[PDB]
Point group: D2
Chain length 293, copies 4
């Protein structure tokens, strides 16, 4: 199984993408063993980026690595189509889209039509990003089968039965979980890995959990998994999408600038208090030699 | 109380705003007794619109009426701020924003700061659009009080207890419902009216329900409310946001063009089945002398 | 419209029904204008009573008043049937049942069969008690129509659209709300009243809200309604089912003994603090002359 | 890890416990490799049983095996206390209770006191049965830690993160899942097993899945898990609790009598359609040599 980082988009003080900070972040991720980078995902504030900014992010990351899944979705199908076609000139793993968000009570026929349109135009394999809490819709294993063109799915949901059903109904589909708390479990139960937002700031931890689980050291994997779980809880105190910036600077030693408001940056006191919550976890990760200080 | 139309955005075949069809629609709604027009709402596919397109919608409706609430929100606060400021040169009722959508687990502090920022820059009264199913967040009466700068709220939620609580904690706030099935109830329980998506296609019905309720003819207001409920139920079969285009053409006699995919238009057969579902209702309404012909 | 009290079941220190305290409570309720008493409902800890205790409660209340709706439901259909038949010798308003609780994923056919069986044996009109949160199932207006034998329904749900749909599909059915916060709204919108748990301790308030609303004094009704809303919030601090005992003693001047554990009685400090929360509301109700001290 | 059967309660035509059919069933389950029997659970219609009937179920299964967890909970704490104490004279694995059901908005303090009371009186280890959908309350890992006296937990919930959290906060607690679709996953991620309702009718399947998973043959455990998933899906068509009677007769060859209404038995046609839905699965299982014949 794989660990895929939904990579953070660093912004400047003037609310532009800070490409050089992004390249440094992507470079470190790959060096630490991340298999692939999911660009323009939730953690990257994809929904807050213009089409032109989504392309900007692809080009920056591609200067570091071609192991990219390129998220192109949005509420303007013409823009999503254009981004899909633009990717033909890149040697990337695939494109991806979440379901059309905001609008509830969308018909299944229209949801299927949206994804089938993206498949019809894609020059690359297509990954379903299923995130029912964020988008308001579930593209479950039956619907994914009906759509019929997905190479893989990322299932972000509080229900691993739902995730397993993709393998059950689509046995040749790649199936990933979006739950950082399930890295050990996903690996142990025959699924294909995790798209882990916490791998932005603790890539060492996420790959080691998975490796321990694949070495049949489940107890050791769960011990490390439970420590990762505690860092995730701390990031939720002040909002995980904002806190991800602070935690990456803290654990990896370079800064990712700013989020894009309304994803507001933590102030200096929130940062202080967040670091207080994870300081001891860092110390234990250093002792275990997962972190080189 | 008032009926406010979240006005549909007509699109061209090549996915541009059809300003001419939009003026025709706005003129009819005002002519038929609609009090104000809510622009770039859900029914107008506001989240599908770029900032420039949101302002293009304002300019077109502004050629018809000053009775406009201008929705400006989105996931780029700089863009929403820019639209709020640009509205100074329009003599309109107010601006409005739904909560930041898509992202779950946003802190209350960040949500409050988002709305307060818009208030600080607004040259007009500010209206909260609360729509928890669509945005994933609830800005309830307590948080609205905390934010402290709203002139009104539109509460799109089936729980009218929630809606009444805005009046109980903010007695000077205008309080509207977004649930078309509650026009008679809202008007009769002391609230300030409905932003009614079905007033796009049956403004005569929505206005007459409000009138009967104001006269305390509640039994007669319910009979018409219950017929209106049946048209909403029919609109959902193929998807409400797409079906509203078809229903406005059927009942009001003019074309509103296309929606913006992934809000796909109904096909000719879907149109036929929908008309068949409501043509009896139209007869019942002609008989009742609410609709001509 | 009517105010119906789901009457509290007082228990002794030895976990038996205190019949004499119940008779005093029922007597006061009727004297203060409550139209009818719903016996063995949620507020009466019906689900915690044996069949024999449910009958006990009927006989005690019937010594005071025949205006009784007798709740008989449970997970042993044979017992529910026996209680239904036993009521033939009483001149009561009707029997009632909530849907079979605990078990999820019950088929609609089995739910319909359960209620139709109770109708087949009832010597009195039958009321549907719909409480989806408590039972896990919704017996909505379509299902109630399918069942076809309900004289009335009590809808306890956070959604007045749902409640109105019973009138829309069953125009000759009595339709009540179980939301104490909606007394004014229910009366104003053409529904038949409220089964109000707060009428146990403030029957004066509940009947006056309804009366003001029917006198077309909606503002005055809402003012009193919002004060009742504040008492309900206070009862939730420590658990409303337990707090109902303390609040009835406080406002009505007689005690109702104890609840049945696990509905634990508040201790003396919780009681102190609860009274602190409503002390000022009592003072304002005295000033308004709704309460005679 | 272990497979534990929440054993079905067979009823007679006249609605009494059929002790003879219950012993036959318990004997077969032990014979086929089931580790322990959970008595008066959901699958056994425990909430439909009186206290005397819960004890009658214990005595009957106790004639067969000592490997019993005895569920004793209910809405009369005196009755649950009495059953806990009566269990002293049985050499069994432990007692158990689901949370107080039906009543919403029970305070955490009252829920904690309920479980602590049972612990104080118990002559055996105490197991928490957590089933939020059925009871309306969640007793999560933190509250279980607060209660502090549980030897194990059965977590009936699709979110395995929730289940894992019991191990993370209570490392010495036995942690079981109640989701049959997760037997392979649970066994492979370091948890202590499943209380599997489908082990009533396919104990051979449930035991073999656990075995394959323990051998780290996860792919082969998933294939059998996915066939087991199909039988559960078929059981839901007409209602799982009723259908389990029919499925145990089909697969294990002996009659388990009737359920207790409103858990109504399937009718002869419903039985035929269910068998038709699973007879292919039976062939696939015979072919795989998991079932004889």
């Amino acid at each position: 199984p794989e660990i895929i980082t939904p990579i953070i988009t660093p912004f400047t003080k003037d609310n532009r993408i800070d490409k050089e900070k992004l390249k440094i972040h992507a470079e470190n991720l790959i060096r630490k063993g991340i298999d692939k980078l999911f660009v323009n995902g939730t953690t990257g504030l994809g929904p807050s980026l213009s089409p032109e900014e989504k392309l900007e992010n692809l080009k920056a990351v591609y200067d570091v690595t071609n192991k990219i899944i390129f998220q192109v979705g949005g509420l303007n199908l013409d823009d999503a189509i254009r981004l899909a076609k633009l990717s033909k000139d890149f040697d990337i793993v695939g494109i991806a889209s979440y379901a059309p968000y905001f609008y509830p009570r969308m018909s299944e026929k229209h949801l299927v039509k949206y994804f089938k349109t993206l498949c019809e135009v894609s020059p690359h394999p297509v990954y379903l990003f299923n995130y029912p809490t964020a988008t308001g819709k579930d593209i479950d294993a039956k619907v994914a089968k009906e759509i019929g063109c997905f190479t893989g799915v990322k299932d972000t949901i509080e229900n691993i039965i739902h995730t397993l059903d993709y393998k059950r109904l689509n046995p040749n589909m790649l199936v990933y979980s979006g739950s950082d708390m399930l890295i050990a479990t996903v690996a142990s139960t025959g699924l294909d890995g995790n798209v882990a937002f916490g791998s932005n700031y603790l890539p060492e931890v996420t790959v080691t959990i998975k490796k321990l689980a694949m070495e049949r050291k489940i107890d050791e994997a769960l011990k490390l998994q439970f420590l990762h779980d505690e860092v995730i809880e701390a990031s939720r105190i002040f909002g995980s999408l904002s806190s991800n910036y602070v935690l990456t600077k803290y654990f990896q030693g370079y800064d990712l600038g700013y989020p894009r408001p309304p994803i507001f940056p933590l102030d200096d006191e929130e940062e202080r208090q967040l670091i207080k919550k994870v300081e001891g976890i860092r110390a234990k990760l250093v002792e275990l030699k997962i972190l080189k200080e």
